[PDB]
Amino acid sequence: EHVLTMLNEHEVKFVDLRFTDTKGKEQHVTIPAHQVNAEFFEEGKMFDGSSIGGWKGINESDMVLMPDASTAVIDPFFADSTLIIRCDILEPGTLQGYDRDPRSIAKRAEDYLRATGIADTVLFGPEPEFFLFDDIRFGASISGSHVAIDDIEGAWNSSTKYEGGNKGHRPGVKGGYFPVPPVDSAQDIRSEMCLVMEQMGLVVEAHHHEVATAGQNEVATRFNTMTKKADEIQIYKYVVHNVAHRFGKTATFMPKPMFGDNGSGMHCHMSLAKNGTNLFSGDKYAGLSEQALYYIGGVIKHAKAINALANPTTNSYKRLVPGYEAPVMLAYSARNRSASIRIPVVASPKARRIEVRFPDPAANPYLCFAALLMAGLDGIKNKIHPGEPMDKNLYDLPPEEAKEIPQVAGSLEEALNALDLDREFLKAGGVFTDEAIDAYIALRREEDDRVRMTPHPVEFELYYSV
Amino acid sequence: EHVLTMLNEHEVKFVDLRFTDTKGKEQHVTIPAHQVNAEFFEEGKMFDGSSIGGWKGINESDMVLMPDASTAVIDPFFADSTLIIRCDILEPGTLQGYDRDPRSIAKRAEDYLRATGIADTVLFGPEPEFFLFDDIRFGASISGSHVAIDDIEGAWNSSTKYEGGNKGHRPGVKGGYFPVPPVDSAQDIRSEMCLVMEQMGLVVEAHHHEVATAGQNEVATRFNTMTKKADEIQIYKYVVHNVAHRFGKTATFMPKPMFGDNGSGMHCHMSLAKNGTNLFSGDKYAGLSEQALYYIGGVIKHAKAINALANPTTNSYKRLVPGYEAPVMLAYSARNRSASIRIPVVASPKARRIEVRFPDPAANPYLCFAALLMAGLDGIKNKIHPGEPMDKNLYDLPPEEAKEIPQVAGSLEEALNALDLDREFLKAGGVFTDEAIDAYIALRREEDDRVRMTPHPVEFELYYSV
Amino acid sequence: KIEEGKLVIWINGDKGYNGLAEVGKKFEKDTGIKVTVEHPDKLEEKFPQVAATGDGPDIIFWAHDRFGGYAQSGLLAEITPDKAFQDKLYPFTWDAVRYNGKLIAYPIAVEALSLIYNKDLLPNPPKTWEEIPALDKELKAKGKSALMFNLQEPYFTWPLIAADGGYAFKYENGKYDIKDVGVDNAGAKAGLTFLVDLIKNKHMNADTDYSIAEAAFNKGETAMTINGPWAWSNIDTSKVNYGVTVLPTFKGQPSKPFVGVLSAGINAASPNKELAKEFLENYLLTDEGLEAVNKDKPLGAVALKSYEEELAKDPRIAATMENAQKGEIMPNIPQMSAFWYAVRTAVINAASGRQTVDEALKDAQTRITK
Ligand SMILES: OC[C@H]1O[C@H](O[C@H]2[C@H](O)[C@@H](O)[C@@H](O)O[C@@H]2CO)[C@H](O)[C@@H](O)[C@@H]1O
Q1: Which of A8, A20, B59, C242 has the most CB atoms within 10 Å of its CB?
Q2: Would the CB atoms of B68 and C366 count as touching at under 8 Å?
Q3: Where are the beta strands (DSSP E) in chain C?
Q4: Which CATH number does the domain C112-259+332-369 belong to among 3.40.190.10, 3.40.50.2300, 3.30.930.10, 3.30.1250.10?
Q5: Which chains touch C (3 or more CB pairs under 8 A)?
Q6: Which cysteine pairs are joined by S-S bonds (chain C)?
């Protein structure tokens, strides 16, 4: 009913139905507002399943788009007044919730949480970073391939001739952390993104330029319950992509667009709760509950499999490389930023939580968050102890005992394989089905293949004169 | 409370938190106005220390941003109403004031002044000069390097073909001192800078074109207490940089962008006071107190170490070279403008003070001012007599006794080394810690190395045919 | 909004609420509207809370510094006396109750702290804060003390802090600059230091409150106290032989009390506004109504010219006016509540030795220009 009044209040002409595919990309279809009736909400609208990658095959194409009336929000970019309504994908007749629908999967995972009685709500606070460029060009054909990035902030443009003169105040390599404008050219745009994000229901905590030259930026938003947060991530990306477009830029959430400067990560802060109390505060290490520790143990035990969802691109592994600040060591600490799991030191026990640092923004919200949870729960159910916190150092020196302690997957294939083998913790509660998992893996292997099979420019530098 | 009313009065949407790094560069991060609450002021906001150069290392990243409510001022450039609030960097829990935070260091120095009881307030009147260009291009790679400067005022453009014709009224080399427009092309811009500076709390005394061709300019502002003045310098630079940007120009505070014409200096007028009386007026030389003389003696004794903060760039030493007007002779006088310390001849004893001429605008406000003070105090505490005033001549003829009288450092390395050895006067009162000093030196040595190791264009002219 | 067809009044416990109740009585005997007088603790704090909900008293009495904040939160009704009624009161008193040019209360009396001394222990009061330590030394030898006053309320200590230059908000071109505060300047620091030194050196104790100070002077144990007109009643009752005079100087400058205009505001939430106005303008704000109240607890200098005329001639009243003249009328801006809580912490922390003066005043300064 709230929806039917929003239609009149904003004189809506269209309703934009949205959903996410397996890869994590928001999709949409539009219907005139006059097509929204009572039926619409109880039985949804029909659409072809076979069209989305990794979904229904040759025989069972048709499926249901079920509008979730709680998600109604006005689109701030479209020319004609239109209302966005996120939808779940349900199996026809049964109206159950498609095994391969990432939002259904995430909901199932929140259900299973309540079911085990371990807690009643999961809290996710992801920190996606991104880049804002002016020009992005790439291609690949039989005779070669290339990628060219360009932005007014790129340090390389210190020598570029410009029509009205080079005004040259640019962030150097790894020198983007906070120079005030004009070095930072994105203040106005970061704020528009903030205002718009809030007009769309998100709550913004801060915004700032990130480390890399050439437009790395970040908008920090307040956490929320798992599934609602993944929804927020999708909106977040949408706002970022579109505000950038409107400003004459182009944004990307790729994890490592440039060799030699910062990649973009999506740290995930998590905590559990029951009847308003934070199940993660306690007397143990850094203010943690023993529940938190088991959770951590779970995440560490299933890290490589989580990688397949939290770092789902070959590019993801160009960020997760033996570097200093590389969040690749499977350990926890409240200081050592070598550890992929940081423990925020905060006063109020109400805010005690863990920060899993290896995820990147390419990750499917839904599936990434879900896999993080399931690993945590399995860590609890099986009281998987974390061991002791690493407070020493990262991957380089150490190099004492060859420092072969836990680490995240080193390639996408490896992560996919881990997901293959270590799938039980995900199938728990019937959240993830084998079919879903196998389909996801197949989609990504096809991607992994393109990169493995196509000659790399660097290979010419290294081996042309062989 | 004044802040919370400014938020409503100006319908502020954002709060821009600002601070300065070791090198002296203003940094910032933004939060929505709605994130400003009671907590904010008493406990500040958390941020990653490890991100700023020369700050926390591998283990102790997190630190506190403490808003200083006295600094609240509206940003005149941002599109959405935003309030700027300068912050200090405090150690978490202890909330003490980071050893490496330049603003904390400057505050500590003002405290130590009051503590010794020598005076209750320090007065700083710096005169930063700057350049306004149209085009600045530079680069350096394995196959070469270059820098190209361009401005409509540059004398070299007397021969340039322009789209709508060359209107040719340009300041010749060293000929910028006051030709009225159109020779002086920056009247309107210098005034906007003035108006804006005042809207931001500064008090302007004058503005004029400086000596060099190609846009050297200066906005003179009224002195203020040491730490508040360094704040003003940061704002000053911000206004200059941004008004220039808005006018289609690009400003630089580099000390010597061009060989063959004036560099940019930042003379520092100083004086001490107690209960409203000027501790620098007296019956001694030129109207000075004996306290002033000891202060001068201190500055002269520790000049080379002060250089490391007042002339922190290799470029700084391209301004401080055996030239006629080069403020390089460590001496005082009320006339001889060869002397790096001028004594302004003024009537009212209330305005008696000293002018240390060798500083340049690249200097960190905070650290430069602080080092100047500490050297002065050590000159007092130890009654370091100045000797007699130099009223003869500069560096050239003289050349009698080879004229080896005191001089400022001749290179950055030399200055850094002096700072290394002569650090006691800075550690006094626990103002500067060894760690802070060593970190600063390390940051600059890395810079010094780039210049020492990269072939210079002139080296080709001089040695390619060797 | 509640209320009824009756009148409920809230006034501070140190004022003559029984005189006020005698005035409700002939309001009621002459009207049928019964008046109820209460004096809740923290009323100045409790009001905004309950009035916000549309309830509370029909009429609220407090010094005018709290009224700007009540008005900005919308808790008071704009009053409208005509020039004839207005004419009966000193005009600087209507100015005190103006917020954004509107009148938001009726001014009742002009309050300023004075030095009260025991003529029998000290026939001649000290003219300077600086000779107090010596004086204490002498009395103490005789089992007495020179001075005791409420250290828990910043209002009692502000005259010394302000003497050599401390200030709340700079008054600059028709208005108060909320970012220009003088709680941490050199005069303010000299003032608090002097106080802390009194304690340090055992001339005073950090815990003295209103009751301890009052019992001390009233029993003859201390030779002086600092208080307002409302304390005179109990003194009379104890029969001490007391004088009321100007506060001592500090560094040669006068002590500068903040001056308060006792004021009566009407709850925006009352159904009774007209009743309320009748009461104030026609019952209380007369020579007769003021005198019923003043016989209970003295008001100080009254804003009603006619009554004020009979009031002082009284040397106690003349002294009140002299300290008032050396003082400064408080601002009524919403920011007065932040100022007071910040200055309250600062003094207690500094007197208790929890913080140094410099540290205390600096925190206060920061807190306020929050
Ligand atoms: O101590 C702060 C306090 O000062 C003033 O309160 C006075 C009041 O004006 C007098 O009438 C008398 O009752 O005593 C009070 C001090 O206990 C302000 O009026 C008040 O707002 C402030 O909190």
Answers
A1: A20
A2: yes
A3: 7-10, 35-38, 59-63, 98-99, 102-103, 106-111, 114-118, 145-147, 167-172, 175-182, 222-227, 242-245, 258-266, 301-302, 328-329
A4: 3.40.190.10
A5: B
A6: none
